[model samples]
Target: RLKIVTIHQEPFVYVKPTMSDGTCKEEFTVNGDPVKKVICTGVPQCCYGFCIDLLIKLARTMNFTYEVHLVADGKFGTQERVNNSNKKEWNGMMGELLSGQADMIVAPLTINNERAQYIEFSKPFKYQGLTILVKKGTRITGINDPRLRNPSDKFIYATVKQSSVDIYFRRQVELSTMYRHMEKHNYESAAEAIQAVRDNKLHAFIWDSAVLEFEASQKCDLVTTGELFFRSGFGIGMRKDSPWKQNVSLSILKSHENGFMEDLDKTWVRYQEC
Candidate 1:
């Protein structure tokens, strides 16, 4: 059976309200930190979202059996130094897949050159870019119609720890200059960063534009700012050279060709409340 790994990302993957009565556990460590993994006991109902829907569709179309479970640490993936050595290793779902603990990943995992070197990605199902979220009426305006080319240093601007957004800020020449000077406000989840914006604890929360769009639509007081940068696509991740890679990638192509992915975005990501 294929062991699919995922994380909680709105419009992508969400924990269902109920779970099976039984539980099975596994233990492992990443970067010396212990992790207790809980296997999902039920198929399909344990979680539901865009990626989950995509997972089900792909499975049925490919005629494969699978199990889905969230990453124990909830991190998409982060490179961490190993034992004070210069060597680095990936942690989270990426780590699990590379180390043979998982066979596939169906989250909104961004397709990036840095990551593509280590694992295979099913053709991206959604294309998005980086943006910012801020509380409405706040003076921290993006001078250019929600596109702030250069963010001011006076406010606390932050992104989720170890996310692609964070990596971008740290790597871009200009953005890195700004990133280093600002006080770091590391967040583990987009929800926490968005909530910080809602509570005024943070002035600007940088993240995926689509995720910001979903959050902005749900909260009247929240608005997304900044021009989309470092355009990227969300892809399903798998171990490099895995035999099923071609099958999964082709199914994603079919999903795109048939416009099923577009329907999912409109039905899920594009919904609005305010």
Candidate 2:
């Protein structure tokens, strides 16, 4: 019965507010900017997303109950070792875990080397890669406008803020120009970034394949290039101090065996077919 911490991300974890009657509550900047500003909250029974379902399934199957928590810093549990510090200073989801504030983290937590020493992971439930989301046939005319024949143009593409905090995007920034061209305005959210492209305000968004796929399939204007450009796996995160490592692993396996993973995918992801 410890805290279950999460960040506001799409398709993987969505923590937002809702009305008393189970409808979304909307708040916008007077200037009309968007946020993960949703609040569809009530109880374990009222949340939504791929990982939320997995959490609930594990609880029901393993007979465990927990409280859901939303992280103040919007990171997906990423960290690096600093030379002179007493210990690594953690921020975002990682801070919550290492500080003993959270027992579990259920967002699009990737399994990688830096985080391996601090926590245990459940078997991967989903493969998250990167893809380019662009609206089909949207055109802008200009003298020096970069041609959009490929993902080659620097000015036309975008990504969320602090993409480097995630291990995959960080390396991509150095190795390639795909994500380095992101605009400051596009850092708002995946929904906003994709909306910019769909509106032809921007030419493309380069981010996680999962959320891009969701936007492409659900929206009428945007479509993924079906790229599957970069790849990583997502797993349930447990702090090293927790006693449920083995129990959590068993419950994840049971969820897979009981077809919860597949069914959740069908409901949340399969429709996209991306």
Candidate 3:
């Protein structure tokens, strides 16, 4: 049996309340008019639900029986839950893989140099980077543009801790003269940071392109600026000693070759464009 893990984030993954037993005949409304609404369920803070869904779909093609186990924390993957909880629980999950407590981790887990030491990753399924979300009228074209050179005019940026955007923004923009005056706002979730930008409380915010695009569609007041400014990839996470690593890696390659990745992009990423 396959057990998947996921967190809820809009457009990527969220629960919409459907008619249950046809009760409560009144139609839902956002403002005043009747409109159907989906009550979002699962973790409310993750931006990687699309990746998780894609993995689940791909895994099904291999005849894997899967069940999704959601952790209360909004962070990506089971790893974060383990790290947040006690050490014994963390080791237990790791042991579960060997003992078959779970089949694979299909969450939006990032592949990094340090993480590679303990877990084996499938070929990257999707790529993304730190992107800037700015107001519609901002003059900035790119992060390195000369307009950001003034120390007094530094832009405001925000990100969640341990997120790729946070890691790259600190390494790339925070150390540079152009963005040296840039203020970093730490938010618990990407949606919060996006809201801050939408409210004009922040000049710009750094986030994943997928996340920024999803938020922009929901909140029309904000827009993402320029091309993706940082580079990162999303990969399937598995225990280092798991015997299914080779099969999983090959499946990832096959998914890309068969246009499954393209289909995912069409459904999740490409469709959100303004």
Best candidate per TM-score, number?
Answer: 1
lDDT of 3 by residue, 127-166 (tens): 7566678888886666664554453435565566666455
User: After superposing candidate 2, which stretches have Cα over 4 Å from the reference?
Assistant: 18-46, 80-88, 137-155, 165-188, 272-274
Model 1 RMSD in angstroms: 8.0
Candidate 2 lDDT over residue span 108-199, tens digit each: 88777677787877777777677777787644332112453334444476677656523344465453443344433345666677778877
Ranking of all candidate structures by their lDDT, best first? 1, 2, 3
Best by lDDT: 1
lDDT of 2 at 62: 72
lDDT of 1 at 208: 78
lDDT of each: 0.74, 0.65, 0.59
lDDT (10s digit) by residue, model 1, range 23-114: 32222322243322223533433466678778878888999898877786677887789999999999889898998778998888888887
> Which pairs clash in the backbone of model 1?
146-226
Q: What are the clashing pairs of model 3?
A: 16-38, 17-38, 17-39
Please provide TM-scores, in order, for all candidate models, with all chains considered together: 0.79, 0.74, 0.70
Candidate 2: residue pairs that collide: 16-38, 16-39, 17-38, 17-39, 17-40, 18-39
